[PDB]
């Protein structure tokens, strides 16, 4: 999955 | 000076890495808050004998988004280079792959980019 | 499932061990497999994947330096392991060269590859 | 022989393209069923004077996933080359971008690959 | 749609494009200097009826790097979205492919990213 | 969106 | 090819 | 660099 909590780690 | 140290993206996500003498990158990547649930193992490789012509240092690393608190069933790789000097930087492109069924494999991998510095935002 | 010896269609071969706590460690070599062709591989995988038919997410890196040669470049593979009788690892890769700042825009190639446990 | 023609991927998705003499690609991309609801407009460009040395022909095209029937709020680009020979082929890598909110933009764009030939999969061997 | 107009990246490379009612993008991409030898045909597609929930407008376009003056034997595609606002922006990922021999096809395609605005730098 | 009906067009 | 004059068009 | 001996490792 691509959960929202991963956003910051990807620059987003 | 060098890759070893603490690096930040513009959002304050923070990796702490050691660059070993024979090319290992080892460390952790965590959120700006830095709580335990946010911390993941980071592992990769770099060119330990880069060109001496002003070229950057090629590198890459992976984080699988599982720790002992949660699991996103996904993993990201970053491919890029370290650029030394007064404002050292690591510039990357990334691939984020989710574990998917075979039917959904066509939409398993996102692409993006990010840049890191040693200056805490 | 992941631990073992893998090949692409050209016979390039890596050995990899999927460690207890999510590590991937191994060696990637050419079809000839001479010393000059062998490189360290390190990465990560999901050690507790979903049970619903989903693959196992993973990634790894090889920096193209060993004791014999150095291309001043490194590749990352991002993909998934799919188990069963014909186990496969399907990947997308990024290959980045060390470049000057002027050439950084053309530093990174993209591609794909698939690996199986059967010698071609 | 050449880019102009009807091309298929392994799942039978079908694009019908015309390669104009000065570099335009125009046509349609449809499903293996090929009904109107499955059909989308394609436009792109190609190198109309490729190198004479064994190299392929660079090309690219876009499909926005909207037609008169439905709208996925997304678009794909394919970047690759045409390769002539015994079985001509177009080899590509693609980027599929969804319209997203700014918060979700980091997960807007998928990457992948595909290959096309002029042989319909039902006739393939 | 807001896409029709003149757009610039940070280096001043600039495209002038029309977003037609039929979903077409048509225009010209040129260098910051903008001499005739620098100009190329651009064609693409965009979503002519985007969502009304704050989402961007999906789009893509291609430039083949041939004009009557020069030919790089390559072509680039940009995939991205238009983001409306007080200052509109187009954010993209790109793929640049060269014509190569089969033996060199593995290294035929570069990846990158760029962003454009309507403000000349 | 990335609806399932787009899969075949992307090779999947 | 990827000649240097293309750099600006790609953001570099 | 992207020397030709890397091709096989990249599937080409």
Short mmCIF file of C-alpha atoms in Angstrom, two decimals:
data_model
loop_
_atom_site.label_atom_id
_atom_site.label_comp_id
_atom_site.label_asym_id
_atom_site.label_seq_id
_atom_site.Cartn_x
_atom_site.Cartn_y
_atom_site.Cartn_z
CA UNK A 1 0.00 0.00 0.00
CA UNK A 2 0.83 3.71 -0.32
CA UNK A 3 -0.62 5.10 2.93
CA UNK A 4 -0.68 8.84 3.52
CA UNK A 5 1.75 8.58 6.42
CA UNK A 6 4.49 7.73 3.89
CA UNK A 7 4.12 11.09 2.10
CA UNK A 8 6.76 13.10 4.00
CA UNK A 9 9.43 10.44 3.49
CA UNK A 10 8.90 10.82 -0.28
CA UNK A 11 8.98 14.64 -0.23
CA UNK A 12 5.20 15.01 -0.39
CA UNK B 1 32.60 16.25 5.00
CA UNK B 2 31.22 13.07 3.41
CA UNK B 3 28.09 10.95 3.18
CA UNK B 4 28.24 9.81 6.82
CA UNK B 5 25.96 11.97 8.92
CA UNK B 6 22.39 13.15 9.39
CA UNK B 7 20.41 14.22 6.34
CA UNK B 8 17.04 15.96 5.95
CA UNK B 9 14.58 16.51 3.13
CA UNK B 10 12.64 19.80 2.94
CA UNK B 11 9.90 18.32 5.13
CA UNK B 12 12.32 17.34 7.88
CA UNK B 13 12.22 13.58 7.30
CA UNK B 14 15.59 12.51 8.64
CA UNK B 15 18.06 9.76 7.83
CA UNK B 16 21.10 8.95 9.89
CA UNK B 17 23.65 7.02 7.86
CA UNK B 18 27.16 5.61 8.01
CA UNK B 19 29.10 5.24 4.77
CA UNK B 20 31.55 2.35 5.30
CA UNK B 21 35.04 2.19 3.79
CA UNK B 22 34.07 -0.52 1.25
CA UNK B 23 30.82 0.92 0.02
CA UNK B 24 28.10 0.11 2.56
CA UNK B 25 25.36 2.57 3.50
CA UNK B 26 23.65 1.64 6.77
CA UNK B 27 21.28 3.60 8.95
CA UNK B 28 17.73 4.61 9.72
CA UNK B 29 15.09 6.85 8.20
CA UNK B 30 12.46 8.52 10.39
CA UNK B 31 9.81 11.20 10.33
CA UNK B 32 10.34 14.79 11.35
CA UNK B 33 8.64 13.94 14.72
CA UNK B 34 11.01 11.00 15.16
CA UNK B 35 8.76 8.69 17.20
CA UNK B 36 9.62 4.96 17.22
CA UNK B 37 6.68 4.01 15.01
CA UNK B 38 8.15 6.33 12.34
CA UNK B 39 11.63 4.78 12.18
CA UNK B 40 12.78 2.27 9.55
CA UNK B 41 16.01 0.54 8.57
CA UNK B 42 17.90 2.00 5.59
CA UNK B 43 20.47 -0.06 3.67
CA UNK B 44 22.36 0.65 0.42
CA UNK B 45 25.62 1.07 -1.45
CA UNK B 46 27.80 3.90 -2.71
CA UNK B 47 30.92 4.35 -4.86
CA UNK B 48 33.72 4.41 -2.29
CA UNK B 49 36.28 5.60 -4.86
CA UNK B 50 34.50 8.27 -6.93
CA UNK B 51 36.00 10.13 -9.86
CA UNK B 52 38.23 13.10 -8.99
CA UNK B 53 36.95 15.32 -11.85
CA UNK B 54 34.13 17.16 -10.02
CA UNK B 55 31.62 14.33 -10.55
CA UNK B 56 29.24 13.37 -7.78
CA UNK B 57 29.34 10.07 -5.93
CA UNK B 58 26.85 7.49 -7.19
CA UNK B 59 24.70 5.82 -4.57
CA UNK B 60 21.43 4.07 -3.83
CA UNK B 61 19.46 2.78 -0.88
CA UNK B 62 16.27 0.96 0.08
CA UNK B 63 13.77 1.30 2.90
CA UNK B 64 11.10 -1.39 3.31
CA UNK B 65 8.13 0.21 5.08
CA UNK B 66 7.87 -2.37 7.84
CA UNK B 67 9.02 -1.94 11.41
CA UNK B 68 7.91 -3.58 14.65
CA UNK B 69 4.92 -1.15 14.90
CA UNK B 70 3.37 -1.09 11.41
CA UNK B 71 3.68 -2.40 7.90
CA UNK B 72 2.67 -0.69 4.65
CA UNK B 73 3.58 -3.70 2.45
CA UNK B 74 5.80 -1.54 0.27
CA UNK B 75 9.42 -0.52 -0.20
CA UNK B 76 11.19 2.46 -1.76
CA UNK B 77 14.53 2.72 -3.50
CA UNK B 78 16.41 5.97 -4.03
CA UNK B 79 18.98 6.29 -6.81
CA UNK B 80 21.19 9.36 -7.02
CA UNK B 81 24.39 11.07 -6.18
CA UNK B 82 26.13 12.84 -3.36
CA UNK B 83 27.59 16.27 -4.21
CA UNK B 84 30.13 17.58 -1.70
CA UNK B 85 31.23 21.12 -0.84
CA UNK B 86 29.96 23.96 1.35
CA UNK B 87 26.32 22.88 1.01
CA UNK B 88 26.55 19.12 0.53
CA UNK B 89 23.49 17.56 -1.11
CA UNK B 90 22.12 14.19 -2.15
CA UNK B 91 19.87 14.40 -5.22
CA UNK B 92 17.66 11.38 -5.91
CA UNK B 93 14.94 9.80 -7.96
CA UNK B 94 12.87 7.14 -6.20
CA UNK B 95 10.70 4.13 -6.97
CA UNK B 96 8.02 3.06 -4.44
CA UNK B 97 6.68 -0.44 -4.99
CA UNK B 98 3.69 -1.96 -3.23
CA UNK B 99 3.09 -5.68 -2.84
CA UNK B 100 0.10 -6.28 -5.15
CA UNK B 101 -1.89 -9.05 -6.73
CA UNK B 102 -0.81 -10.08 -10.23
CA UNK B 103 -3.89 -8.28 -11.62
CA UNK B 104 -2.76 -5.02 -9.97
CA UNK B 105 1.00 -5.35 -10.66
CA UNK B 106 0.79 -2.79 -13.50
CA UNK B 107 0.01 -0.15 -10.84
CA UNK B 108 2.52 -1.37 -8.25
CA UNK B 109 5.30 1.21 -8.72
CA UNK B 110 5.28 4.98 -8.25
CA UNK B 111 8.11 7.27 -9.35
CA UNK B 112 9.29 10.51 -7.81
CA UNK B 113 12.22 12.58 -6.66
CA UNK B 114 13.69 14.25 -3.59
CA UNK B 115 16.76 16.10 -2.38
CA UNK B 116 18.52 15.94 0.99
CA UNK B 117 20.95 18.24 2.83
CA UNK B 118 22.67 18.20 6.23
CA UNK B 119 20.92 21.43 7.27
CA UNK B 120 17.94 20.82 9.55
CA UNK B 121 14.89 22.73 8.21
CA UNK C 1 11.14 -17.97 -0.78
CA UNK C 2 13.43 -15.09 -1.69
CA UNK C 3 16.62 -16.70 -0.40
CA UNK C 4 18.49 -18.47 -3.18
CA UNK C 5 20.04 -18.07 -6.59
CA UNK C 6 18.33 -15.97 -9.24
CA UNK C 7 18.93 -15.41 -12.97
CA UNK C 8 17.75 -13.00 -15.63
CA UNK C 9 17.31 -14.02 -19.30
CA UNK C 10 20.95 -13.24 -20.08
CA UNK C 11 22.19 -15.49 -17.27
CA UNK C 12 23.37 -12.68 -14.98
CA UNK C 13 23.01 -14.21 -11.54
CA UNK C 14 22.69 -13.08 -7.94
CA UNK C 15 22.72 -14.99 -4.72
CA UNK C 16 20.59 -13.39 -2.04
CA UNK C 17 19.69 -14.12 1.53
CA UNK C 18 16.45 -12.72 2.95
CA UNK C 19 17.41 -12.21 6.59
CA UNK C 20 15.19 -12.62 9.61
CA UNK C 21 14.63 -8.87 10.13
CA UNK C 22 14.11 -7.67 6.55
CA UNK C 23 17.63 -7.52 5.16
CA UNK C 24 18.67 -8.57 1.67
CA UNK C 25 22.36 -9.42 1.30
CA UNK C 26 24.20 -11.05 -1.54
CA UNK C 27 26.36 -10.90 -4.63
CA UNK C 28 25.45 -10.12 -8.26
CA UNK C 29 27.69 -11.46 -11.04
CA UNK C 30 27.78 -11.90 -14.79
CA UNK C 31 26.95 -15.00 -16.77
CA UNK C 32 30.73 -15.68 -16.97
CA UNK C 33 30.92 -15.17 -13.19
CA UNK C 34 34.64 -14.32 -12.98
CA UNK C 35 35.96 -12.34 -9.96
CA UNK C 36 35.96 -9.06 -11.88
CA UNK C 37 32.20 -9.49 -12.50
CA UNK C 38 31.06 -9.86 -8.87
CA UNK C 39 29.49 -7.01 -6.90
CA UNK C 40 27.96 -6.66 -3.44
CA UNK C 41 24.14 -6.35 -3.31
CA UNK C 42 22.26 -4.99 -0.28
CA UNK C 43 18.59 -4.16 0.24
CA UNK C 44 15.39 -4.68 2.18
CA UNK C 45 12.17 -6.68 1.86
CA UNK C 46 8.80 -6.93 3.62
CA UNK C 47 9.34 -9.81 6.06
CA UNK C 48 5.60 -10.10 6.81
CA UNK C 49 3.78 -9.70 3.48
CA UNK C 50 0.02 -9.82 3.00
CA UNK C 51 -1.58 -13.28 2.71
CA UNK C 52 -4.16 -12.28 0.05
CA UNK C 53 -2.17 -13.22 -3.08
CA UNK C 54 -0.10 -10.03 -3.03
CA UNK C 55 3.59 -10.16 -3.84
CA UNK C 56 6.35 -9.26 -1.39
CA UNK C 57 7.71 -5.74 -1.78
CA UNK C 58 11.48 -5.39 -1.94
CA UNK C 59 14.38 -3.33 -3.23
CA UNK C 60 18.14 -3.53 -3.49
CA UNK C 61 21.20 -1.60 -4.63
CA UNK C 62 24.44 -2.51 -6.38
CA UNK C 63 27.23 0.08 -6.62
CA UNK C 64 29.31 -0.88 -9.68
CA UNK C 65 32.65 -0.90 -7.88
CA UNK C 66 34.62 -3.96 -6.82
CA UNK C 67 38.35 -4.63 -6.30
CA UNK C 68 38.87 -4.90 -10.09
CA UNK C 69 36.85 -2.14 -11.74
CA UNK C 70 34.68 0.87 -11.08
CA UNK C 71 32.00 2.28 -13.37
CA UNK C 72 31.22 5.23 -11.02
CA UNK C 73 27.56 4.30 -11.02
CA UNK C 74 24.97 2.46 -8.97
CA UNK C 75 21.64 0.75 -9.70
CA UNK C 76 18.56 0.30 -7.56
CA UNK C 77 15.89 -2.32 -8.27
CA UNK C 78 12.38 -1.82 -6.88
CA UNK C 79 9.84 -4.60 -7.23
CA UNK C 80 8.14 -7.63 -5.80
CA UNK C 81 8.70 -11.30 -5.24
CA UNK C 82 5.91 -13.58 -6.43
CA UNK C 83 6.18 -17.10 -4.99
CA UNK C 84 5.06 -20.53 -6.16
CA UNK C 85 6.29 -23.23 -8.52
CA UNK C 86 7.66 -20.60 -10.93
CA UNK C 87 8.81 -17.97 -8.45
CA UNK C 88 9.76 -14.61 -9.93
CA UNK C 89 11.07 -11.21 -8.93
CA UNK C 90 9.69 -8.43 -11.14
CA UNK C 91 11.55 -5.12 -11.03
CA UNK C 92 11.93 -1.58 -12.26
CA UNK C 93 15.45 -0.14 -12.00
CA UNK C 94 17.23 3.20 -11.87
CA UNK C 95 20.91 3.40 -12.86
CA UNK C 96 22.66 6.60 -11.77
CA UNK C 97 26.13 7.74 -12.82
CA UNK C 98 28.31 10.08 -10.87
CA UNK C 99 28.28 13.21 -13.07
CA UNK C 100 29.23 16.83 -13.00
CA UNK C 101 26.44 19.24 -12.06
CA UNK C 102 26.17 20.28 -15.72
CA UNK C 103 25.43 16.66 -16.69
CA UNK C 104 23.21 15.71 -13.73
CA UNK C 105 20.05 16.00 -15.83
CA UNK C 106 21.27 12.96 -17.80
CA UNK C 107 22.60 11.00 -14.80
CA UNK C 108 19.79 8.45 -14.39
CA UNK C 109 18.56 5.72 -16.72
CA UNK C 110 15.36 3.75 -16.15
CA UNK C 111 14.53 0.19 -17.10
CA UNK C 112 13.08 -3.12 -15.97
CA UNK C 113 14.00 -6.76 -15.55
CA UNK C 114 12.60 -10.03 -14.23
CA UNK C 115 14.47 -12.78 -12.39
CA UNK C 116 13.67 -16.46 -11.87
CA UNK C 117 15.33 -19.39 -10.12
CA UNK C 118 15.83 -21.27 -13.48
CA UNK C 119 19.09 -21.01 -15.48
CA UNK C 120 18.42 -19.84 -19.08
CA UNK D 1 7.02 -1.67 -43.06
CA UNK D 2 7.22 1.30 -40.67
CA UNK D 3 5.42 2.87 -37.70
CA UNK D 4 2.13 3.46 -39.53
CA UNK D 5 -0.20 0.54 -38.87
CA UNK D 6 -2.07 -1.43 -36.26
CA UNK D 7 -0.15 -2.52 -33.18
CA UNK D 8 -0.99 -4.82 -30.28
CA UNK D 9 0.36 -5.47 -26.82
CA UNK D 10 0.29 -9.00 -25.36
CA UNK D 11 -3.19 -8.44 -23.92
CA UNK D 12 -4.55 -7.38 -27.32
CA UNK D 13 -4.92 -3.67 -26.56
CA UNK D 14 -4.76 -2.14 -30.02
CA UNK D 15 -3.43 1.13 -31.34
CA UNK D 16 -3.95 2.29 -34.81
CA UNK D 17 -1.43 4.97 -35.73
CA UNK D 18 -0.41 7.11 -38.66
CA UNK D 19 3.16 8.40 -38.75
CA UNK D 20 3.17 11.62 -40.81
CA UNK D 21 6.20 12.44 -42.98
CA UNK D 22 7.46 15.26 -40.74
CA UNK D 23 7.09 13.59 -37.38
CA UNK D 24 3.46 13.48 -36.21
CA UNK D 25 1.86 10.42 -34.64
CA UNK D 26 -1.95 10.37 -34.69
CA UNK D 27 -4.46 7.66 -34.00
CA UNK D 28 -6.50 5.78 -31.45
CA UNK D 29 -5.84 3.29 -28.66
CA UNK D 30 -8.55 0.79 -27.75
CA UNK D 31 -9.09 -2.43 -25.81
CA UNK D 32 -9.00 -5.94 -27.24
CA UNK D 33 -12.83 -5.71 -27.40
CA UNK D 34 -12.50 -2.48 -29.42
CA UNK D 35 -15.94 -1.01 -28.67
CA UNK D 36 -16.38 2.78 -28.75
CA UNK D 37 -16.28 3.15 -24.95
CA UNK D 38 -12.81 1.52 -25.01
CA UNK D 39 -11.33 3.92 -27.59
CA UNK D 40 -9.17 6.96 -26.81
CA UNK D 41 -7.34 9.55 -28.90
CA UNK D 42 -3.54 9.23 -29.20
CA UNK D 43 -1.07 11.94 -30.34
CA UNK D 44 2.70 12.00 -30.35
CA UNK D 45 5.92 12.59 -32.24
CA UNK D 46 8.70 10.52 -33.76
CA UNK D 47 12.11 11.05 -35.36
CA UNK D 48 11.27 11.22 -39.08
CA UNK D 49 14.96 10.98 -40.09
CA UNK D 50 16.55 8.31 -37.86
CA UNK D 51 20.27 7.53 -37.93
CA UNK D 52 21.42 5.18 -40.71
CA UNK D 53 23.56 2.93 -38.51
CA UNK D 54 21.42 0.16 -37.02
CA UNK D 55 19.72 2.42 -34.48
CA UNK D 56 16.00 2.38 -33.80
CA UNK D 57 13.62 5.31 -34.24
CA UNK D 58 12.85 7.43 -31.17
CA UNK D 59 9.20 8.21 -30.47
CA UNK D 60 6.65 9.11 -27.84
CA UNK D 61 2.92 9.56 -27.46
CA UNK D 62 0.19 10.50 -24.99
CA UNK D 63 -3.31 9.24 -24.24
CA UNK D 64 -5.57 11.17 -21.85
CA UNK D 65 -8.05 8.68 -20.40
CA UNK D 66 -11.19 10.65 -21.28
CA UNK D 67 -13.58 9.94 -24.13
CA UNK D 68 -17.31 10.63 -24.64
CA UNK D 69 -18.24 7.73 -22.35
CA UNK D 70 -16.02 8.01 -19.28
CA UNK D 71 -13.12 9.84 -17.68
CA UNK D 72 -10.44 8.39 -15.41
CA UNK D 73 -8.84 11.83 -14.74
CA UNK D 74 -5.45 10.52 -15.78
CA UNK D 75 -3.10 10.42 -18.76
CA UNK D 76 -0.27 8.15 -19.88
CA UNK D 77 2.83 8.88 -21.92
CA UNK D 78 4.90 6.22 -23.67
CA UNK D 79 8.56 6.85 -24.54
CA UNK D 80 10.49 4.38 -26.64
CA UNK D 81 11.66 3.31 -30.03
CA UNK D 82 10.49 1.54 -33.15
CA UNK D 83 12.71 -1.37 -34.22
CA UNK D 84 12.30 -2.87 -37.71
CA UNK D 85 13.15 -6.42 -38.79
CA UNK D 86 11.53 -9.85 -39.07
CA UNK D 87 8.93 -8.89 -36.44
CA UNK D 88 8.82 -5.10 -36.05
CA UNK D 89 8.45 -3.90 -32.48
CA UNK D 90 7.85 -0.76 -30.47
CA UNK D 91 9.47 -0.98 -27.04
CA UNK D 92 8.33 1.53 -24.43
CA UNK D 93 8.44 2.76 -20.93
CA UNK D 94 5.39 4.65 -19.68
CA UNK D 95 4.34 7.17 -17.07
CA UNK D 96 0.70 7.27 -15.91
CA UNK D 97 -0.29 10.41 -13.99
CA UNK D 98 -3.56 10.92 -12.15
CA UNK D 99 -5.02 14.28 -11.33
CA UNK D 100 -4.55 14.49 -7.55
CA UNK D 101 -4.83 16.97 -4.74
CA UNK D 102 -1.60 18.71 -3.83
CA UNK D 103 -1.34 16.52 -0.68
CA UNK D 104 -1.45 13.36 -2.83
CA UNK D 105 0.77 14.58 -5.67
CA UNK D 106 3.72 12.52 -4.43
CA UNK D 107 1.72 9.40 -5.39
CA UNK D 108 0.38 10.78 -8.69
CA UNK D 109 2.63 9.00 -11.17
CA UNK D 110 3.10 5.30 -11.89
CA UNK D 111 5.91 3.94 -14.04
CA UNK D 112 5.90 0.83 -16.19
CA UNK D 113 6.74 -0.67 -19.56
CA UNK D 114 5.17 -2.41 -22.53
CA UNK D 115 6.01 -3.73 -25.95
CA UNK D 116 3.93 -3.77 -29.14
CA UNK D 117 4.01 -5.75 -32.39
CA UNK D 118 1.81 -5.88 -35.48
CA UNK D 119 0.64 -9.46 -34.66
CA UNK D 120 -2.77 -9.89 -32.99
CA UNK D 121 -2.40 -12.13 -29.87
CA UNK D 122 -5.21 -14.50 -31.01
CA UNK D 123 -3.05 -15.26 -34.11
CA UNK D 124 0.30 -15.28 -32.23
CA UNK D 125 2.57 -18.35 -31.98
CA UNK E 1 -8.70 25.01 -18.66
CA UNK E 2 -5.92 27.50 -17.75
CA UNK E 3 -3.31 25.50 -19.65
CA UNK E 4 -3.35 27.69 -22.78
CA UNK E 5 -0.48 30.15 -22.58
CA UNK E 6 3.27 30.58 -22.38
CA UNK E 7 5.14 28.50 -19.80
CA UNK E 8 8.72 28.57 -18.52
CA UNK E 9 10.99 26.32 -16.51
CA UNK E 10 13.63 27.71 -14.12
CA UNK E 11 16.19 27.89 -16.93
CA UNK E 12 13.86 29.91 -19.13
CA UNK E 13 13.11 27.18 -21.67
CA UNK E 14 9.63 28.00 -22.83
CA UNK E 15 6.65 26.43 -24.48
CA UNK E 16 3.63 28.15 -25.92
CA UNK E 17 0.62 25.86 -26.02
CA UNK E 18 -3.07 25.76 -26.80
CA UNK E 19 -5.32 23.42 -24.84
CA UNK E 20 -8.16 22.71 -27.27
CA UNK E 21 -11.73 21.89 -26.38
CA UNK E 22 -11.11 18.38 -27.86
CA UNK E 23 -8.40 17.52 -25.26
CA UNK E 24 -5.49 18.35 -27.56
CA UNK E 25 -2.29 20.16 -26.61
CA UNK E 26 -0.51 21.85 -29.54
CA UNK E 27 2.38 24.27 -29.57
CA UNK E 28 6.07 25.02 -29.75
CA UNK E 29 8.90 24.36 -27.27
CA UNK E 30 12.03 26.53 -27.56
CA UNK E 31 15.17 27.48 -25.67
CA UNK E 32 15.58 30.52 -23.43
CA UNK E 33 17.32 32.28 -26.35
CA UNK E 34 14.47 31.15 -28.61
CA UNK E 35 16.24 31.27 -31.99
CA UNK E 36 14.63 29.30 -34.83
CA UNK E 37 17.12 26.38 -34.53
CA UNK E 38 15.89 25.89 -30.94
CA UNK E 39 12.17 25.43 -31.76
CA UNK E 40 10.35 22.10 -31.82
CA UNK E 41 6.79 20.92 -32.32
CA UNK E 42 4.96 19.82 -29.14
CA UNK E 43 1.80 17.68 -29.15
CA UNK E 44 -0.11 16.06 -26.31
CA UNK E 45 -3.40 15.49 -24.52
CA UNK E 46 -5.06 16.70 -21.34
CA UNK E 47 -8.19 15.95 -19.33
CA UNK E 48 -10.73 18.49 -20.63
CA UNK E 49 -13.16 17.80 -17.77
CA UNK E 50 -11.13 17.47 -14.56
CA UNK E 51 -12.55 16.62 -11.16
CA UNK E 52 -13.95 19.49 -9.08
CA UNK E 53 -12.53 18.32 -5.73
CA UNK E 54 -9.20 20.20 -5.74
CA UNK E 55 -7.44 17.64 -7.95
CA UNK E 56 -5.09 18.77 -10.68
CA UNK E 57 -5.63 18.27 -14.39
CA UNK E 58 -3.80 15.26 -15.86
CA UNK E 59 -1.81 15.85 -19.03
CA UNK E 60 1.08 14.67 -21.15
CA UNK E 61 3.02 15.76 -24.19
CA UNK E 62 5.85 14.71 -26.49
CA UNK E 63 8.65 16.53 -28.30
CA UNK E 64 10.80 14.69 -30.85
CA UNK E 65 14.16 16.47 -30.95
CA UNK E 66 14.20 16.98 -34.72
CA UNK E 67 13.65 20.20 -36.60
CA UNK E 68 14.98 21.25 -40.02
CA UNK E 69 18.22 22.51 -38.47
CA UNK E 70 19.27 19.66 -36.20
CA UNK E 71 18.34 16.19 -35.03
CA UNK E 72 19.33 14.57 -31.74
CA UNK E 73 17.67 11.22 -32.65
CA UNK E 74 15.71 11.29 -29.43
CA UNK E 75 12.30 12.23 -28.06
CA UNK E 76 10.96 13.22 -24.65
CA UNK E 77 7.59 12.68 -23.03
CA UNK E 78 6.32 14.65 -20.04
CA UNK E 79 3.61 13.22 -17.80
CA UNK E 80 2.09 15.38 -15.11
CA UNK E 81 -0.65 17.69 -13.97
CA UNK E 82 -1.71 21.30 -14.15
CA UNK E 83 -2.35 22.83 -10.74
CA UNK E 84 -4.62 25.88 -10.82
CA UNK E 85 -4.20 28.71 -8.36
CA UNK E 86 -3.20 32.32 -7.96
CA UNK E 87 0.00 31.17 -9.69
CA UNK E 88 -0.65 28.16 -11.92
CA UNK E 89 1.98 25.43 -12.25
CA UNK E 90 2.55 22.30 -14.32
CA UNK E 91 4.50 19.57 -12.51
CA UNK E 92 6.01 16.76 -14.58
CA UNK E 93 8.06 13.59 -14.75
CA UNK E 94 9.82 13.00 -18.06
CA UNK E 95 11.32 10.15 -20.09
CA UNK E 96 13.94 10.94 -22.76
CA UNK E 97 14.59 8.10 -25.21
CA UNK E 98 17.32 7.87 -27.83
CA UNK E 99 17.30 5.78 -30.94
CA UNK E 100 19.93 3.09 -30.22
CA UNK E 101 21.14 -0.22 -31.53
CA UNK E 102 19.50 -3.25 -29.90
CA UNK E 103 22.74 -3.81 -27.98
CA UNK E 104 22.47 -0.33 -26.42
CA UNK E 105 18.68 -0.29 -25.90
CA UNK E 106 19.07 -0.98 -22.16
CA UNK E 107 20.60 2.50 -21.84
CA UNK E 108 18.19 4.25 -24.21
CA UNK E 109 15.92 6.02 -21.70
CA UNK E 110 16.69 8.68 -19.13
CA UNK E 111 14.24 9.78 -16.43
CA UNK E 112 13.81 13.14 -14.74
CA UNK E 113 11.40 15.82 -13.64
CA UNK E 114 10.62 19.49 -14.21
CA UNK E 115 8.13 22.16 -13.28
CA UNK E 116 6.77 25.08 -15.30
CA UNK E 117 5.00 28.35 -14.50
CA UNK E 118 3.68 31.30 -16.54
CA UNK E 119 6.30 33.67 -15.00
CA UNK E 120 9.39 34.36 -17.14
CA UNK E 121 12.50 33.91 -14.93
CA UNK F 1 -7.58 7.71 -10.89
CA UNK F 2 -6.04 4.37 -11.87
CA UNK F 3 -9.19 2.27 -12.42
CA UNK F 4 -8.88 -1.43 -13.15
CA UNK F 5 -10.25 -1.08 -16.70
CA UNK F 6 -7.00 0.73 -17.59
CA UNK F 7 -4.90 -2.35 -16.74
CA UNK F 8 -4.81 -3.96 -20.19
CA UNK F 9 -3.78 -0.72 -21.89
CA UNK F 10 -0.71 -0.66 -19.61
CA UNK F 11 0.24 -4.30 -20.25
CA UNK F 12 -1.25 -5.70 -17.03
CA UNK G 1 21.63 11.02 -28.48
CA UNK G 2 21.50 13.26 -25.41
CA UNK G 3 23.45 16.35 -26.56
CA UNK G 4 24.25 19.14 -24.14
CA UNK G 5 21.97 21.66 -25.90
CA UNK G 6 19.01 19.56 -24.69
CA UNK G 7 19.87 20.08 -21.02
CA UNK G 8 17.87 23.28 -20.47
CA UNK G 9 14.72 21.78 -22.01
CA UNK G 10 14.92 19.03 -19.36
CA UNK G 11 15.49 21.41 -16.43
CA UNK G 12 19.28 20.95 -16.21
CA UNK H 1 29.51 5.86 -16.50
CA UNK H 2 27.30 3.31 -18.25
CA UNK H 3 29.89 0.92 -19.77
CA UNK H 4 28.73 -1.84 -22.10
CA UNK H 5 29.70 -4.65 -19.68
CA UNK H 6 26.83 -3.47 -17.44
CA UNK H 7 24.21 -4.32 -20.07
CA UNK H 8 23.54 -7.90 -19.05
CA UNK H 9 23.08 -6.98 -15.40
CA UNK H 10 20.31 -4.59 -16.51
CA UNK H 11 18.50 -7.18 -18.65
CA UNK H 12 19.91 -6.05 -22.01
#
